[PDB]
Amino acid sequence: MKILRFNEGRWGVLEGELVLETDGPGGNPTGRRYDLASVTLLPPATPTKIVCVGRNYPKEPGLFLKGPNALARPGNPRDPWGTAEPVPYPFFTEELHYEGELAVVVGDRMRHVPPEKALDHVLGYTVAVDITARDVQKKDLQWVRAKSADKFLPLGPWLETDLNPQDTWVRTYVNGTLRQEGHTSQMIFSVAEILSYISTFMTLEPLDVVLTGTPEGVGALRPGDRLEVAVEGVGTLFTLIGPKEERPW
Amino acid sequence: MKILRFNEGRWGVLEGELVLETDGPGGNPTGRRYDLASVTLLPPATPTKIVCVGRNYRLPKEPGLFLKGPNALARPGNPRDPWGTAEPVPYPFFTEELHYEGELAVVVGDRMRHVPPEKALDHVLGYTVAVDITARDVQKKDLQWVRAKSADKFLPLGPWLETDLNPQDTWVRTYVNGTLRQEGHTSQMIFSVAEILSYISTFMTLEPLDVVLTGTPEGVGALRPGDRLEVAVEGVGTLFTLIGPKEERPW
Numbered sequence: 001m002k003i004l005r006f007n008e009g010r011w012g013v014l015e016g017e018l019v020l021e022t023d024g025p026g027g028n029p030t031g032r033r034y035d036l037a038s039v040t041l042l043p044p045a046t047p048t049k050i051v052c053v054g055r056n057y058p059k060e061p062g063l064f065l066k067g068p069n070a071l072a073r074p075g076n077p078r079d080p081w082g083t084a085e086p087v088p089y090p091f092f093t094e095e096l097h098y099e100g101e102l103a104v105v106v107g108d109r110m111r112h113v114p115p116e117k118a119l120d121h122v123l124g125y126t127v128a129v130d131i132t133a134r135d136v137q138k139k140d141l142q143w144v145r146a147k148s149a150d151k152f153l154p155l156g157p158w159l160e161t162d163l164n165p166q167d168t169w170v171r172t173y174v175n176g177t178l179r180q181e182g183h184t185s186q187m188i189f190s191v192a193e194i195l196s197y198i199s200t201f202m203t204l205e206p207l208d209v210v211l212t213g214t215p216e217g218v219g220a221l222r223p224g225d226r227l228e229v230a231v232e233g234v235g236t237l238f239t240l241i242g243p244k245e246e247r248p249w
Numbered sequence: 250m251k252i253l254r255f256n257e258g259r260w261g262v263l264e265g266e267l268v269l270e271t272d273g274p275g276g277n278p279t280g281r282r283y284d285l286a287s288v289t290l291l292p293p294a295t296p297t298k299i300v301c302v303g304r305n306y307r308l309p310k311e312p313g314l315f316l317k318g319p320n321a322l323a324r325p326g327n328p329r330d331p332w333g334t335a336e337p338v339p340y341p342f343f344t345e346e347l348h349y350e351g352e353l354a355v356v357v358g359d360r361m362r363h364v365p366p367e368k369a370l371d372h373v374l375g376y377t378v379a380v381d382i383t384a385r386d387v388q389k390k391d392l393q394w395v396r397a398k399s400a401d402k403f404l405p406l407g408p409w410l411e412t413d414l415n416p417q418d419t420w421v422r423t424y425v426n427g428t429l430r431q432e433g434h435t436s437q438m439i440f441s442v443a444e445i446l447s448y449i450s451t452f453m454t455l456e457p458l459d460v461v462l463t464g465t466p467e468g469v470g471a472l473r474p475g476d477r478l479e480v481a482v483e484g485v486g487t488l489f490t491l492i493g494p495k496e497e498r499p500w
Contacts, residue, residue: 048297048318048319048320049298049318049319049320051318051395054392062391062392062393063391063392063393063395063396064392064393064395065316065318065393065395065399067297067298067300067316067453068297068298069297069298069453069454069456090452092451092452111401112499112500114500140313140314141303141309141313141314141315142313142314142315142316142393142394143393144300144314144315144316144453145314145452145453148316148453149452149453150362150452150453150454199499200342200343200499201341201343201396201400201401202318202320202395202396202399202400202401203320203401205319205320248363248450248451249363249365
């Protein structure tokens with residue numbers, strides 16, 4: 001089942017081309033319905049925090065954080081490039097990378113949850129583009145500016161509630177050209193193991209977002225570049241890079 | 250004035266020993282009042298994120314930064330009964346090098362994006378106190394300081410925020426089990442509060458009620474289960490917190 005957030009933070013379930021509004025994620029229908037093209041798609045979550053895995057394609061998962069300010073609206077499939085929220089090419093970097101990833105939206109609070117019970121706390125899966133500024137990532141104290149600058153996390157188009165996270169494909173296309181491709185069965189740490197690990201020291205709240213890592217093929221980006229990340233059984237995330245920004249003031 | 254959050258996420262202003270409830274932070278009074286001793290003090294903010302500064306007391310060219318998730322927030326001890334109300338910070342199973350760092354904390358009032366240093370402070374709602382709990386061992390080995398700085402309860406915050414203050418003219422003092430361990434004058438900050446907020450805003454938009462930590466003075470030492478911590482910031486207040494028993498295997 002596809003669950004989405006749209007317009008002024010509304011929730012709904014996608015029924016073909018019809019968006020059936022619900023009271024809360026996957027909740028009872030309110031009675032309103034909208035044509036998919038007529039709504040403004042939003043990241044399918046309202047996270048208190050975003051936890052991301054490093055190399056996943058290490059005795060334990062490497063983790064880093066992104067603030068919610070990194071979230072960027074996904075392009076509406078009915079009009080991709082005309083609606084996707086642009087990721088400004090930062091003035092502080094010159095090594096901007098992209099990383100297509102499978103993303104997890106937590107459904108139930110998780111604290112000290114064993115691997116075998118981890119997926120039961122998942123609301124659904126969605127797609128993300130972990131934007132990275134590699135040049136500052138090497139010289140900064142921590143990856144704050146490198147991974148958590150504004151819009152460094154396009155997320156969407158919606159989440160799928162029924163899926164086998166360890167058996168799906170992630171394909172990233174840059175300007176129509178396939179640049180990344182990977183099978184989640186090749187994950188060093190499974191989604192379940194990742195969520196479980198995190199829960200040992202950090203409680204995951206309902207609707208928090210967890211990035212599962214990026215496959216091989218990470219390349220550079222240029223202003224104007226158009227990205228398309230398709231994840232079998234989930235959906236396709238459309239996002240693009242905006243023009244180079246100048247000095248802040 | 251002193252603004253606080255209490256009970257079921259209610260906001261209020263402090264007058265002596267009375268908490269006067271308001272509609273939002275510093276908002277209109279509702280007409281309800283409570284005795285301080287009768288309410289459950291909460292961290293004075295509901296941050297979308299917590300941005301922290303690294304070394305900042307007397308050298309880096311730019312402020313070093315790191316994040317903490319809201320899960321790190323821990324209730325401040327109520328000044329009317331400190332040790333009996335403060336939310337304990339469990340001594341984690343994953344570390345054996347837990348350290349304390351008392352710090353001045355800032356609570357953002359108005360959204361900040363590309364704000365120059367000279368306009369920074371005008372966007373501040375107020376100032377409060379914090380203890381940046383740190384697990385030093387994992388901090389050296391892990392990929393990033395996630396469990397080193399963002400483990401549950403790694404951020405006691407409170408007791409409340411002060412709206413009227415000169416951030417660069419106050420003292421931060423940390424006491425452990427009745428003994429002074431840290432003492433720093435904020436005028437000795439490498440980066441001023443205004444510069445820190447400004448810097449952050451050049452790439453990261455700060456939302457209303459986000460929290461920003463401004464670094465810690467010398468005196469960072471090791472903690473032990475049962476330690477009673479007090480961080481006093483002149484003109485702001487005193488944050489009371491404590492370390493709980495060491496935890497064992499997660500499951």
